[model samples]
Structure formats: C-alpha cells, structure tokens
Target: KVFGRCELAAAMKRHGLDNYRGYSLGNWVCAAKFESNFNTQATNRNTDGSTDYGILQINSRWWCNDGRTPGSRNLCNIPCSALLSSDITASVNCAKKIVSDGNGMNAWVAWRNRCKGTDVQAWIRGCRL
Candidate 1:
C-alpha cells in the first residue's frame, strides 16, 4: 500500500515510532520517505547480492531470511517477505529490533544521507501526530 505523508505519520505513531529510541517521529517519517516513498512493496538488491525489502528497506543479509542471502543472520527472525505486507506490523517490529540492537537509525543509508542531522520536522508538518 502507498501511504500519504500524514497517513504514514499516523501509522508510525500508532506503531510506537514517535520518539522511539530517541529518534523523533519526523526522523522516522523522513527516512521512510526516502527509503520507499511510503510504499510497502519497495525492494532493492544490493551489489553484494543481498536484497533490501519493504517500506523500511530491511536488509536480507542481517535482518531477514530471504533464503537467498548466504549465511543470513536473520536477526529479526522473520522472512523477508513479511516486510512487504501492507500491514506494516512486521516491518515496524523488525525495525524496532534493529534500532534496539545497537545499529540505530543509521542502519539505512537513506537515513544517513537524507534525514540525518537535519531538522526533519518538515517531514511531519501538519500531521495530527
């Protein structure tokens, strides 16, 4: 499913993304904007052969078992396909695990490059939060 900016903000807030791990709701929204444009079915293959999946672009190499990434750690203990669902519960849960695991939000290059160190509040402007 594709989410409008405010719609995505509402969903993320409901899922506990607001101020999660000291990251603001804007940070999460900003990252998601760049990572998948709020689309649930986004995927991108890496040069190393592992693929990123779903809205947050969770990686197959360390986060999910795609049955293709050699020696995948599967730290999220979920199948990569789970991240693609429009429900977003699995993806949000996995993302929580990822941040709590010490990687933090920098795990996604999109975040580091696009959202990091910026005010980011504009990402969630006018959202009812």
Candidate 2:
C-alpha cells in the first residue's frame, strides 16, 4: 500500500522507535528500502531460505506466526494487515525486539550504515560490527 507519515510512524512506533538516532523517518525509510524495498507486499525466501514478507520484511512463519497469531491470513500466513489494521505498535515492536537488542533505532542504524548512504569505500566499515 501507499505509505504516508502516519503509516510509517505506526510501523516505527510499533517497533518501539521513540527517539531519532541522529536521523528521522529517513532512517526507517532507508531501512525499509534495504529490507523490503518499501514494498509492503514484498515476500522473499531468504538465502538460507525462509519466508520474509511485508514492508519490514517480516518472516510470517517465523516472525509473525512467532509466539503470536494474527487475525488475518495470507497463503496461510499471518497477513501483514495486522501491523497496520489490528495493532501496528504490537506488530512492529515485536520486530524491533527480534532484530534489535531492544535498541529500537540503533538496530536500523546498523542497517543504514551497512548500506553506506554516505560512504563509498570503507572496505571495512561494517565488517566488524
């Protein structure tokens, strides 16, 4: 779907993003780009192979169907709709806890640096993190 300020914010807040890690929506937006190409419907079977779907690139089987359940289903999968429809905060917070050490924004920062939006030749930037 089309992402607006409130849409992304809902995702951010759900993931426990409260403070700006030196940046604003650009951080999460960038992270979304790298993760799911900002495609809320994007689905991928990872390198090792796993089903990752939605804007946050969540693995429905692992992440969404995790110690949890959703009100809707997609291909017998936990529909991405919950994050935006039922409980956006709960849905995203779960991701924040899983991906980050509850560091919220820092977790995303790690992703952005990995992309090197400003850096061109590190040859060793995120090689040690």
Candidate 3:
C-alpha cells in the first residue's frame, strides 16, 4: 500500500509515533517519505548484504531477521518479511523499538539527509490529526 502523505501521517499518529522519543509526528512522516515514499512493500538491499524492509525501512542487519543478514540481532524480534505487509503495525512497532533502543530517528540515513533539521511539519500540513 502506497499511502498519500496525509493518510500516512494519520496512520503514524494512530500507531503512537507522534512525539515518540521526543520526535514529532512530522519527523516520522518526513522520514517515511524519504525512506520508502510511504510504500508498505518497499524494500532496499544494501551492498553490505543487509536488506531494509517496509515503510520505515527497518533493516535486516540489526532490527529484523531475514535469515540472510550475517549476525542479525533480530532486535525487533520479528521476521523481516513482516515489515513488507500492507498492515504497518509491525513496522511502526519495530520503529518505536528502534528509537527506544537509543538510535532515535537518526538511525535512518534518509532522515538525516532529508528530514533532520528541516521543517518536517510540512510533511503533515493540513492533515487532520
């Protein structure tokens, strides 16, 4: 499922991403826009043999177990495949865990390059939160 900007914002807020770990809803929404363009089935494979999965692009190297990433911690305690589902519950939960684990939103390079220090609120403008 590829969500429209406001739709994804509403969903993220419902999932408790708003202000989670001191980051605003806009931060998460902006990160998702850059990370996976709000596509639930988005996937990216790194040259280092790790795969990023889902809307938030949780990585197989540390977050989810893909059975192929060497030394995967499975820190999210979920199968990597789960992140690709149209149902984004697992992805949102795993992302929360990622932030709680002290990585924060900086864990995503896309966020750093695109969202961090920017007016992320623009990502959710006019969304009836």
Candidate 4:
C-alpha cells in the first residue's frame, strides 16, 4: 500500500500540526526524495556549469533571475526557494497544489519500482523512505 491513506494521515500528524495542514507533506516529501532526496538546494546536471536550487526540484536559471512568489511560472512550477519561505499554513498549501497537479508520489513510486533492492531509494520507492 504505497502512498497509502494512512501515511497521508501520519504526515498530517507529524508535519501538519496546525492550521497549516491543507497539503499532504508526506506525498510532497516523497516526490522530493524520489526526485532529489529532499535536498532543499538540489540541482540537475547540464552541458554548462549553471545550476538550479531548492526542493520541488525547480530549475531557477530559466524562470528566475532574482526571486519572487507565485513564481514566474505556474503554481506547481513556482520557485522552490519561495516555496521554502511560506511559513506554516502556506507551506502545506503549496504541497496541496503540487499533489493536485498529478506530481503525486505514486508516479515516483512507479519510477523507482524496478530498483527496489533494499536502500533509501528502495524504501522510499517502497513507501517508507
């Protein structure tokens, strides 16, 4: 039962302990870990030496020159840096937006399903990473 509803509930319990509970942090964290291991300032490799930053795995070089909220892109593609500063309630709210857009952890679950050999990637890909 990967990404099971009970995990969602535990996420609400651990990370959603306030009015800041609109989104499912568990799912978003799974997405982040699945994509980049929850590293807040992660990057993807390119031909050149430029870089991207933050969770949500955003590529800041394209959408941002400085910084802003609501992002230079759409909701799900907002600057990952801004997503980091959303305070409490707004934090989970952002998570809700991404989850609603179908970047749900389920996809990541399937992505690494073939490599489930007993590792963090395995367990996360397995539902407890």
Candidate that scores best on lDDT: 1
The alpha-carbon RMSD values of the candidates against the true structure, listed in the order shown, are 0.9, 9.4, 0.9, 8.7
The Cα RMSD of model 2 versus the native structure comes to 9.4
Query: Model 2, residue 2: what's the lDDT?
Result: 44
lDDT of 3 by residue, 1-129 (tens): 999999988888899888988999999988888899889899999999999999999999888998999877898899999999888899999998888876688888999998899998888889898
Q: Candidate 1, 84: how far from true, in Å?
A: 0.5
Residues 36-112 of candidate 1 have per-residue lDDT tens digits of 99999999999999999998999998999999999778988899999999898999999999888777998889999
Error of 4 at 8 (Å): 13
Query: Where in model 2 is the C-alpha error above 4 Å?
Result: 4-16, 20-24, 60-62, 66-90, 102-129
Between candidates 2 and 4, the one scoring higher on TM-score is 2
Lowest summed lDDT window (length 10), candidate 3: 97-106
TM-score of candidate 1 relative to the true fold: 0.96
For all predicted structures, in order, the TM-scores are: 0.96, 0.49, 0.96, 0.38
lDDT of 2: 0.49
Ranking by TM-score: 1, 3, 2, 4
Q: Give the TM-score of candidate 4.
A: 0.38
Shift of residue 128 alpha carbon in model 3, Å = 1.4
What digit string (tens of lDDT, one per residue) describes model 4 on residues 44-100? 643443334444444434433334322344444444455444232333445454444
Which whole-number lDDT from 0 to 100 does residue 106 have in model 4?
35
Which residue window of length 10 is worst by lDDT in model 2?
120-129
Per-residue lDDT tens digits of candidate 2, residues 40-126?
Answer: 655566454445656666655445553333442333244444543323454455555554545554444436465446432232223
